[PDB]
Amino acid sequence: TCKITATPSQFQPALLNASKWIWTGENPIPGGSNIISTRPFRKNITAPCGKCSVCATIVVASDDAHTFYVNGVRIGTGAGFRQGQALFVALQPTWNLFAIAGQNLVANSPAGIMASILVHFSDGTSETFVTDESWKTLRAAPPENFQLPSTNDSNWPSAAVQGAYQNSVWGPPVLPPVLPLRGSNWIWTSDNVNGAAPVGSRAFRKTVNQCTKVAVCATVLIAADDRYTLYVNGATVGSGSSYTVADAYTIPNLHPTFNTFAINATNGGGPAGVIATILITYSDGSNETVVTDASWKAIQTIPQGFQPPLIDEFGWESAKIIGAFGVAPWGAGMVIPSA
Ligand SMILES: *[C@@H]1O[C@H](CO)[C@@H](O[C@@H]2O[C@H](CO)[C@@H](O)[C@H](O)[C@H]2NC(C)=O)[C@H](O)[C@H]1NC(C)=O
Ligand SMILES: *[C@@H]1O[C@H](CO)[C@@H](O[C@@H]2O[C@H](CO)[C@@H](O)[C@H](O)[C@H]2NC(C)=O)[C@H](O)[C@H]1NC(C)=O
Ligand SMILES: *[C@@H]1O[C@H](CO)[C@@H](O[C@@H]2O[C@H](CO)[C@@H](O)[C@H](O)[C@H]2NC(C)=O)[C@H](O)[C@H]1NC(C)=O
Ligand SMILES: [Ca+2]
Ligand SMILES: [Ca+2]
DSSP states (O other), X not given: OOOOOOOOEEOOXXXXXXXXXXXXXXXXXXXXXXXXXXXXXXXXEEOOTTOOEEEEEEEEEEEEEEEEEETTEEXXXXXXXXEEEEEEEEOOSSEEEEEEXXXXXXXXXXXXXXXEEEEEETTSOEXXXXXXXTSEEOSSSOOTTTTSTTSOOXXXXXXXXXXXXXXXXXXXXXXXXXXXXXXXXXXXXXXXXXXXXXXXEEEEEEEEOOTTSOEEEEEEEEEESSEEEEEETTEEEXXXXXXXXXXXXXXXXXXSXXXXXXXXXXXXXXXXXXXXXXXXXXXXXXXXXXXXXXXXXXXXXXXXXXXXXXXXXXXXXXXXXXXXXXXXXXXXXXXXXXX
């Protein structure tokens, strides 16, 4: 419906600071003891006039457990209030139905769900939406298909606020990392042997091409021992020079079927590696994760136009796995931006 003029940017974290814990109010004491039960929560959110909504970064926490739905599609299950859970999803352009099944699993114990939904719009702006008293709930188990847009929540009661981010029985949940590096690998060209690699630049390429789906947004987390520059479909996304502080990016304007991620990474001397995690959202509400591994292509002398999407990859080798995230010399302590 809308032209997307947003361009790749530094990733913007969704925060919980304005969000509220909600439950049903079966106990009128907020943060009070509640029965073992499952309860539904719904909120129809519409885009401000003239803007189209594209995708969302979501952080959700629960006491005790939750299932998160968008426009009837299950996008995540999780549990716990000490640390939020990160979710990413593509959106309909003008309205989106968010639905959460929350579960209290311990008798006589508090119950609640808290979520923050950072919507990104076609024009490059964003707005956060939160769980609060405007959500609808029921003092009963969730009806069949409670999460589908076709269910009528007109006669549902309002959710009851259990507490605020900074004033609740739970205290403020810690934000999770935007994406895990656990699961990815430090990779390099195969001249990386015995713990070091030659001085110089190396290039890496990964193409994602699900021709029967519509890709919407990508989130990228990347770090390199020494420095890198990152490209998507030939356009520059960003660059960094730290292997202890990782960078996160949002790509809001993906091509619908074919996207090439390319990295020029440089070694100043000593050990070398590049590591990344990429999440792509699809318009059917599914996602896929890509990590640096041996399915990337790599080359030791970088050719002109190493970044364009459709170059000939003859003479590119499979990238070498230096080690899974955590290996020496870099270890497991990478600083990762908050989701
Ligand atoms: C991506 O989509 C999938 C399915 O829609 C989600 O992953 C699966 O579902 C649960 C929900 O968290 C995951 O914990 C499991 O690891 C997956 N199922 C398995 C391994 O059998 C995932 O939540 C989505 N990611 C988002 C929305 O960021
Ligand atoms: C969420 O709200 C939107 C907007 O209030 C609803 O969309 C409207 O639906 C009516 C009835 O079908 C249409 O006549 C309007 O043209 C729609 N407006 C817009 C701006 O799309 C939407 O149906 C609601 N969704 C749910 C699940 O309640
Ligand atoms: C790949 O990355 C390296 C480092 O960022 C680039 O090398 C730089 O090239 C410029 C010329 O435009 C020099 O002025 C800099 O001094 C170089 N820096 C370093 C650290 O060597 C290289 O040009 C990039 N692109 C390609 C295609 O290799
Ligand atoms: Ca509980
Ligand atoms: Ca080095």
